[PDB]
Amino acid sequence: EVVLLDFAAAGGELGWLTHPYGKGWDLMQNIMNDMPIYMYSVCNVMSGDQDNWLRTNWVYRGEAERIFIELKFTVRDCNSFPGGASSCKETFNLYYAESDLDYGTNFQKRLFTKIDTIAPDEITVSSDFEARHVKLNVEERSVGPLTRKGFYLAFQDIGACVALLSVRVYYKKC
Amino acid sequence: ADRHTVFWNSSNPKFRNEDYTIHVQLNDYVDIICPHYEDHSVADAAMEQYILYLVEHEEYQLCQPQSKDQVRWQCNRPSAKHGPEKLSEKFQRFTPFTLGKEFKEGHSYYYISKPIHQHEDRCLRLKVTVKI
């Protein structure tokens, strides 16, 4: 496996674009298993109308044609909030786009294609807070054939309470 | 958000009376800035480093963590090339991460440190009050 992107391995040195700016996904710091980790988190489950995007850096494709995308993330149950959040969701959407040039800060939603609606196999509940129990989901998807010089991934939140701890993109050689 | 800068170092006179307090709003951030040194000014052994803990009032009062579970961050990069190591705490009401902290309007919260350049001569601590 040749790894093209690995968020956790950057130990907090890698920053990803967020949209709209200063709303939505935030880079957070915590200690887990006695080591410092970083995660992108969002939890606007009470208010109307969330549409928060997190987009990776542009990733040079090289010779990869088919990529595997492994996510690790926690999601909190919408019934675990005192209010009862009637605008709360428990999924988020995974997207990608290919381009021949990095657009940098010029982020355009419309150029992204949805890969999947992602859901947690194990949801975080109230009693997990007092148990300090981390239910870390793993989901993997693949996309291809790729043909352009690089690509982006993006994550769109629409009112969930989600922390994204790992994003690894890789291809297989033989 | 409004962000609040706290320089976490023994030379900061704000810590001088053991009662440094800041007042924030929900969803503000507090950027706690670790001690940081330019490449030759100070001897390596004289460079301050801390363990930071986020603790309850009793632990803050004693200036002593009740357990390793309360370790929040470590200031262990005193001469990092990029600049100071920084802990950026968002005072958010909810988290999806069960090891993190939730903050409520009308409540108060506490950080203490223990030194790693450890002759603990002094208590550094901080109280943060969240408004309604």
Swiss-Prot record, chain A:
Domain Eph LBD: 1-174
Region Mediates interaction with CLDN4: start-end pairs: 1-174
Subcellular localization: Cell membrane; Cell projection, Ruffle membrane; Cell projection, Lamellipodium membrane; Cell junction, Focal adhesion
Disulfides per UniProt: C43-C161, C78-C88
Expression sites (tissue/organ): Expressed in brain and glioma tissue and glioma cell lines (at protein level). Expressed most highly in tissues that contain a high proportion of epithelial cells, e.g. skin, intestine, lung, and ovary.
The organism's place on the tree of life at top rank: Eukaryota
Induction: Up-regulated by UV irradiation via a TP53-independent, MAPK-dependent mechanism.
Post-translational modification: Autophosphorylates. Phosphorylated on tyrosine upon binding and activation by EFNA1. These phosphorylated residues are critical for recruitment of VAV2 and VAV3 and PI3-kinase p85 subunit which transduce downstream signaling to activate RAC1 GTPase and cell migration.
Effect of R76E: Significantly reduced response to EFNA1
Function: Receptor tyrosine kinase which binds promiscuously membrane-bound ephrin-A family ligands residing on adjacent cells, leading to contact-dependent bidirectional signaling into neighboring cells. The signaling pathway downstream of the receptor is referred to as forward signaling while the signaling pathway downstream of the ephrin ligand is referred to as reverse signaling. Activated by the ligand ephrin-A1/EFNA1 regulates migration, integrin-mediated adhesion, proliferation and differentiation of cells.
Entry's family note: Belongs to the protein kinase superfamily. Tyr protein kinase family. Ephrin receptor subfamily.
Disease implicated: Cataract 6, multiple types: An opacification of the crystalline lens of the eye that frequently results in visual impairment or blindness. Opacities vary in morphology, are often confined to a portion of the lens, and may be static or progressive. CTRCT6 includes posterior polar and age-related cortical cataracts, among others. Posterior polar cataract is a subcapsular opacity, usually disk-shaped, located at the back of the lens. Age-related cortical cataract is a developmental punctate opacity restricted to the cortex.
Protein name: Ephrin type-A receptor 2
Organism this protein belongs to: Homo sapiens (Human)
Taxonomy of the source species: Eukaryota, Metazoa, Chordata, Craniata, Vertebrata
Encoding gene per record: EPHA2
UniProtKB/Swiss-Prot annotation, chain B:
Example GO molecular function: ephrin receptor binding
Ranges where the Ephrin RBD domain occurs: 2-130
Keyword set, alphabetical order: Angiogenesis, Cell membrane, Disulfide bond, Glycoprotein, GPI-anchor, Lipoprotein, Membrane, Secreted, Signal, Tumor suppressor
Topology of this chain in the membrane: Lipid-anchor; GPI-anchor
Disulfide bonds: C34-C75, C63-C123
Segments forming a coiled coil: none
Domain of life: Eukaryota
Principal place of residence: membrane
Glycosylation sites: N9
Induction: By TNF and IL1B/interleukin-1 beta.
GO cellular component terms given for this protein: extracellular region; plasma membrane; side of membrane
Tissue: Brain. Down-regulated in primary glioma tissues compared to the normal tissues. The soluble monomeric form is expressed in the glioblastoma multiforme (GBM) and breast cancer cells (at protein level).
Entry comment on modification after translation: Undergoes proteolysis by a metalloprotease to give rise to a soluble monomeric form.
Similarity comment: family membership: Belongs to the ephrin family.
Function as written in the Swiss-Prot or TrEMBL entry: Cell surface GPI-bound ligand for Eph receptors, a family of receptor tyrosine kinases which are crucial for migration, repulsion and adhesion during neuronal, vascular and epithelial development. Binds promiscuously Eph receptors residing on adjacent cells, leading to contact-dependent bidirectional signaling into neighboring cells. Plays an important role in angiogenesis and tumor neovascularization. The recruitment of VAV2, VAV3 and PI3-kinase p85 subunit by phosphorylated EPHA2 is critical for EFNA1-induced RAC1 GTPase activation and vascular endothelial cell migration and assembly.
Protein name per its UniProtKB record: Ephrin-A1
